Amino acid sequence: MIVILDNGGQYVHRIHRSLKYIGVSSKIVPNTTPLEEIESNKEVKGIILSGGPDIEKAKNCIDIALNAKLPILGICLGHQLIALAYGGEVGRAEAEEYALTKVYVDKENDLFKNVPREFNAWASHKDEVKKVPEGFEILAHSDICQVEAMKHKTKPIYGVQFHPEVAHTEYGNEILKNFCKVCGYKFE
């Protein structure tokens, strides 16, 4: 089962629904849930940090990003919080409204197994990762965002700027599936 930290975003239930479509159970929990409670439950195989409105109102995620041993995926805010936790930089950007964005995969790693090199994703770009942390690498970019996706070079920590959990994101469920494969799930 995947635990989803609810960072207050409108697509939190869409993460649960999308994971269900690929046969993976998940549980939405408060974003204040302590790390020890998440990792002592032997049913938990990975952690998703959801989108949400307020990078100041999702600090417990920094502790999680730094100290969890389970794989972690951050989505929009989640991705930004991972960047901040490891000493990268985040800031405001221009294209704030949700829109279909053509994403270019620079490193298949994973997130992008069995995903084409180019695909359209549903994304806002009100905020973005300005400086990838040390020890991370960029996986994907768009015309207007240098960091559409990233991961730690060796740890199973992944970030995406866009929302794979909604239908407008092409191959979104396959991106989710790849993260669940890192979590130990198997898929025909």
The data reach a resolution, in angstroms, of 1.7
- Which tokens is 66 given? 């730094």
Number of structural domains in the chain: 1
Degrees to nearest 5, angle at CA 124 with 77 and 146: 80
User: How far apart are the C-alpha atoms of 177 and 19, rounded to whole Å?
Assistant: 8
User: How far apart are the C-alpha atoms of 58 and 127, rounded to whole Å?
Assistant: 15
Q: Domain span at residue 87?
A: 1-188
Q: Which residue type sits at 55?
A: I
Residue 128: which residues within 8 A CB-CB, separation 6 or more?
80, 90, 91, 93, 145, 146, 147, 161
Between the alpha carbon of residue 139 and those of residues 36, 59, 159, the distances in Å are 30, 25, 9
By the 8 A CB rule, do 107 and 115 touch? no
User: How far apart are the C-alpha atoms of 87 and 132, rounded to whole Å?
Assistant: 8
Q: How was this structure determined?
A: X-ray
Residue 58: which residues within 8 A CB-CB, separation 6 or more?
5, 7, 8, 31, 49, 52, 77, 81
List residues with catalytic annotation.
76, 163, 165
β partners of residue 51: none
Residue 25: which residues within 8 A CB-CB, separation 6 or more?
1, 2, 19
